[PDB]
Each structure stands twice: as structure tokens, then as C-alpha cells.
Amino acid sequence: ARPCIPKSFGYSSVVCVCNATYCDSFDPPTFPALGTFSRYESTRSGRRMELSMGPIQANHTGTGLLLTLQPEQKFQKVKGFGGAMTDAAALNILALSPPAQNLLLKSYFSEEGIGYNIIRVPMASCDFSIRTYTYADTPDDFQLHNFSLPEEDTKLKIPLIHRALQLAQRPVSLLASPWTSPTWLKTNGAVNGKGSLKGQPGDIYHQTWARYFVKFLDAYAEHKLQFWAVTAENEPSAGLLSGYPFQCLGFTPEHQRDFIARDLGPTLANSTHHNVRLLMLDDQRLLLPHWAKVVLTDPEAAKYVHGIAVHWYLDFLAPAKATLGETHRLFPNTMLFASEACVGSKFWEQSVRLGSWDRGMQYSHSIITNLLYHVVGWTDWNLALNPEGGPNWVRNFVDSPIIVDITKDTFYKQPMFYHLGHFSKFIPEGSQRVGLVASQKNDLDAVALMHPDGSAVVVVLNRSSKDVPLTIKDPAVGFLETISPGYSIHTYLWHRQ
Ligand SMILES: *[C@@H]1O[C@H](CO)[C@@H](O[C@@H]2O[C@H](CO)[C@@H](O)[C@H](O)[C@H]2NC(C)=O)[C@H](O)[C@H]1NC(C)=O
Ligand SMILES: *[C@@H]1O[C@H](CO)[C@@H](O)[C@H](O)[C@H]1NC(C)=O
Numbered sequence: 001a002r003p004c005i006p007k008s009f010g011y012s013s014v015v016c017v018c019n020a021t022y023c024d025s026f027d028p029p030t031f032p033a034l035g036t037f038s039r040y041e042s043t044r045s046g047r048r049m050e051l052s053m054g055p056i057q058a059n060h061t062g063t064g065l066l067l068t069l070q071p072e073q074k075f076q077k078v079k080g081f082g083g084a085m086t087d088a089a090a091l092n093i094l095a096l097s098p099p100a101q102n103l104l105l106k107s108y109f110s111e112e113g114i115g116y117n118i119i120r121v122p123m124a125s126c127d128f129s130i131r132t133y134t135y136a137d138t139p140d141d142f143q144l145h146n147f148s149l150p151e152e153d154t155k156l157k158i159p160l161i162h163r164a165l166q167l168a169q170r171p172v173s174l175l176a177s178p179w180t181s182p183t184w185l186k187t188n189g190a191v192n193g194k195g196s197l198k199g200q201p202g203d204i205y206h207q208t209w210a211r212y213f214v215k216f217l218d219a220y221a222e223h224k225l226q227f228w229a230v231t232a233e234n235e236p237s238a239g240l241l242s243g244y245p246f247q248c249l250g251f252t253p254e255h256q257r258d259f260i261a262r263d264l265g266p267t268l269a270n271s272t273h274h275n276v277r278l279l280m281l282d283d284q285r286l287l288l289p290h291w292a293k294v295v296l297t298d299p300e301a302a303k304y305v306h307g308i309a310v311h312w313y314l315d316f317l318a319p320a321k322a323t324l325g326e327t328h329r330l331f332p333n334t335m336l337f338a339s340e341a342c343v344g345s346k347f348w349e350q351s352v353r354l355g356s357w358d359r360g361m362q363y364s365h366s367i368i369t370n371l372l373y374h375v376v377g378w379t380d381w382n383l384a385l386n387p388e389g390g391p392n393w394v395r396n397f398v399d400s401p402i403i404v405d406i407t408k409d410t411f412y413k414q415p416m417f418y419h420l421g422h423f424s425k426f427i428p429e430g431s432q433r434v435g436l437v438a439s440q441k442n443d444l445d446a447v448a449l450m451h452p453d454g455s456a457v458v459v460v461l462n463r464s465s466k467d468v469p470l471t472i473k474d475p476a477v478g479f480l481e482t483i484s485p486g487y488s489i490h491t492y493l494w495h496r497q
């Protein structure tokens with residue numbers, strides 16, 4: 001293990017400072033002996049995923065908070081956790097010296113870090129790019145004879161994805177999302193603003209756009225990268241808005257439905273990439289369940305849709321049950337997956353707030369709410385940004401768990417990094433959420449899961465200032481007596497036999 005080198009930037013908590021020769025890292029994962037539990041703790045006061053162990057007690061008495069495991073109450077199985085390899089993320093990472101690059105990638109993807117097993121890949125340019133480009137900018141190239149990956153893919157994104165996959169012990173899943181089509185496929189002839197595909201589903205514009213997906217997957221496959229899934233479009237609602245400032249492609253739910261049924265579904269199904277999953281929506285959960293009903297009550301569309309991708313704007317609030325809950329109830333066999341989450345969105349908020357414990361708590365609160373409402377995965381936005389929260393060609397700056405200081409050959413691991421880690425490191429793919437009931441009203445957020453091997457994991461977040469004594473009951477083993485300190489997050493792990 002190497003501990004956090006803490007640094008204050010004058011906000012509520014510290015960042016952990018990493019450079020070419022030093023980064024905080026875990027010892028190789030270990031199992032707690034039966035009758036004992038493992039605790040990982042992070043606190044505003046400065047603890048960063050610190051490991052301790054205690055006994056599981058056969059007996060318990062008290063009037064104190066009891067969380068009871070309900071291991072026979074089984075919910076969703078987990079796909080995984082990770083973040084986005086944007087042009088901005090890749091340019092920042094590759095601006096560090098090679099040894100520093102390796103420590104940053106190890107922080108995210110290694111068992112010595114937090115075990116990310118998802119990477120979201122933009123299909124060409126987004127706002128977290130330093131120029132606008134698509135893979136097919138030659139006007140009216142319906143055959144896509146001038147389709148090609150620029151340097152952003154071949155020199156920045158692809159080599160970093162190879163290196164991330166080399167460092168991971170878990171199999172990593174790639175998720176691809178487009179922001180814009182070529183401008184000659186669009187009613188407005190521009191990468192941004194209000195505009196959809198020209199013509200009607202089934203026509204040459206719609207078929208060229210579907211074939212563009214296959215050309216993307218073919219080009220990544222020539223670089224020995226295979227995708228788990230694609231989304232039908234990043235934030236299709238954005239391209240319906242007049243003056244939308246960055247790359248978008250407008251679809252109504254009806255247009256997405258007919259595009260999937262007539263073009264994208266059949267085209268992927270007839271390709272060598274037929275095993276790639278398609279996720280619909282990839283947008284705000286306020287659009288649910290209406291968007292899911294429009295698309296999935298048409299069997300010609302539904303037979304191609306594996307899942308519903310959702311976006312979180314953490315600065316803002318929204319109701320989970322009415323959106324994620326009702327959607328699961330209508331379409332229980334169509335997985336919900338959180339594909340994008342960001343903080344620092346509002347006009348009056350600093351883009352990057354180095355050492356913000358509040359933004360850490362926003363991430364962990366959001367992941368717990370998602371896991372409590374059937375969501376199988378949770379994908380951060382940019383893996384790394386600069387201290388301004390860029391680069392970003394429209395100055396749409398936001399925060400990132402890792403901030404790169406190129407002038408210092410340094411990177412800072414924010415509280416958000418550790419809040420994400422409390423989930424990503426300890427909830428492997430195939431983990432199943434199970435029931436967890438409180439004996440009394442309490443200020444804590446918690447969720448329980450069982451690993452594929454039958455072991456238990458519980459995450460407990462305390463967003464209050466008050467220490468909360470509590471016991472976790474598992475009927476198979478006994479009682480974990482513990483305390484949730486104010487402004488803390490804990491992960492608890494134990495074997496059940
Ligand atoms: C990278 O960070 C490490 C850890 O903070 C720095 O190593 C420390 O260097 C100082 C000053 O030389 C010593 O007082 C400490 O004993 C070192 N700590 C450890 C844990 O080794 C290192 O100097 C930094 N590298 C650069 C180029 O700034
Ligand atoms: C399209 O690609 C071909 C073959 O690489 C090339 O000769 C041609 O000039 C390209 N056209 C444009 C407009 O780039």
C-alpha cells in the first residue's frame with residue numbers, strides 16, 4: 001500500500017497528489033476470514049479507503065439502528081462501473097510523463113486502484129473535444145468511401161484503451177455513443193443546433209447513419225477493440241432544442257423508435273457486430289417512462305433494444321421511483337444503465353473544486369439511489385480534466401474525479417474518485433443487489449449486494465455531520481457492530497460461509 005499525499009485547495013477536503021514516481025495504491029485484494037468483516041473508510045477529515053477488520057458477533061442487544069440483510073430478496077445483477085475516454089480525457093492523460101500516465105491508469109483500472117470495468121467511447125467529437133469532426137466529413141458520401149478514424153482515435157483514445165485493458169484484471173466492457181452525424185445527413189447542415197436526420201426512417205440518410213455505426217465498429221475491430229454496447233444517440237432530446245451549443249442529433253421518441261426498427265437494428269443484426277448490445281434513450285431520466293413506452297411497445301423496435309441508458313445531472317434533483325421505478329415495472333426484462341453523470345453544471349458553481357467532499361457525496365448518493373431503483377451500471381463522464389475542467393471547445397467545463405496539472409507532471413484524485421471507488425472496487429460484474437431494511441428512520445444511505453461467490457458487500461454513506469452507531473444483521477453469520485462517522489462513506493465486506 002502507498003497512502004494518500006493530501007493537499008488542500010481551501011475547500012472542505014483534500015485531494016490525493018500523484019506524480020511520475022508516487023501515487024496512492026492498495027495492497028492486492030484479500031478475503032476477510034469467516035467470522036470477520038473488512039471495512040474500507042473515507043472521511044472529509046482525510047481518510048481515503050483505509051482498511052480495517054473487526055469481528056462478526058453471534059449476539060446483539062440495543063435500541064440502536066439495525067440494518068438487516070435480506071439475502072432471499074434478489075434484485076438486479078450489476079454490469080459494472082467506469083467513465084468516459086473523451087478527447088479531453090485522453091489529451092490530458094497523454095500530456096503527463098509516461099510513468100505518471102501509468103499511475104493514473106492504474107488508479108482507475110488496476111486491482112491496486114478501484115477496478116473500473118466500463119469505458120464509454122464517443123463516436124467522433126463532442127463538447128470535450130478541441131475541434132469538430134466526424135468520421136465522414138466529405139459531403140454526400142452515402143457509400144462512406146471517406147470514412148476514417150482521425151488521430152484523436154488512433155493516437156489518443158485507442159492506445160489509452162489498450163493500456164487500460166492491459167492493467168485491468170477484470171474484463172472491461174466498451175460502450176460507444178455518437179453526439180452528431182456528418183452535417184450532410186442533417187436537416188440544419190451543422191454539428192450543433194436544432195436538427196435531425198434528413199428524410200424518413202428506411203431512406204438513404206437513415207441507412208447511411210446506421211452503416212456509419214458498423215464502419216465505427218469495423219475500424220475499432222481493426223485496432224483489436226470490440227464493443228459490449230452502443231447507444232442509439234447521446235442525448236437525442238438536445239438536437240430538438242434551438243441553438244443547442246455543441247454536437248447533437250435530434251430524435252423524438254417516435255423517430256428513435258422508427259430509426260431503431262427500420263435502420264439501426266437490422267443493419268447491426270446483419271453485420272459481423274450482431275452480438276453488440278443496443279441501448280436506447282442515453283438521456284435525462286425525466287424523459288422516462290414516456291420514451292421507453294414509445295420505443296418498447298413496438299415489437300419491431302423492442303426486439304433490437306437490450307437496455308435503457310440514463311443520464312444524471314447531480315447538481316439538480318429528480319424523482320427516482322416515478323422514472324426508473326415505473327420503467328422497470330413496465331419493461332422488467334430491459335436493463336436500466338447510467339451512461340453519464342456530471343457535477344458543477346449550474347451557472348454559479350466553480351467547474352473544478354479541488355477537494356470538494358460535497359461533490360464526492362453527490363456521486364455516492366446518486367450511485368446508491370440508482371442501485372436501489374434497478375440500475376445495473378454507473379458511468380462517469382470525463383476520466384480526467386485540467387484544473388479549468390477542460391479542454392472543451394464551447395467552454396462547457398465540468399468537474400472530474402482526476403484533475404491533471406500538466407505544468408507539474410501531477411494529477412489530483414478528488415473525493416469523487418474515492419466515493420466512486422467504494423462501489424467500483426467492491427461490486428464486481430454479476431454482483432446482485434439484495435434487500436436491506438432499517439429498524440428505524442435514519443439519515444444514512446445504504447445498499448447491500450452479494451458477489452457471484454456468495455460474499456456480502458454493503459455501502460453506507462453518512463451525509464449528516466452526526467456519528468450514527470449501527471449494527472448490520474446477516475442471519476447466516478451474525479452482527480457487524482460499527483459506527484458511521486459524520487461525512488463518511490464505508491464499504492463492508494464479509495464471507496457468508
Ligand atoms: C512526487 O511525490 C512524492 C510524494 O509526495 C515526492 O516524494 C517526497 O519528496 C519529498 C521531498 O524530496 C520528501 O521529503 C519525501 O520523503 C518524499 N516522500 C516520499 C513518500 O517518497 C516526490 O518528490 C515527488 N516528485 C516530484 C518530481 O515532485
Ligand atoms: C477519399 O479517399 C480516397 C482513397 O483514400 C482518396 O484518394 C480521396 O481523395 C478521398 N477524398 C477526399 C475528399 O478526401
Ligand SMILES: *[C@@H]1[C@H](O)[C@@H](O)[C@H](O)[C@@H](CN[N+]#N)[C@H]1O
Binds near residue numbers: 126234235342396
Ligand atoms: C452530458 C453530455 O452528453 C456531455 O456532452 C456534457 O459535457 C455533460 C455535462 N455538461 N453539459 N451539457 C452532460 O451534459
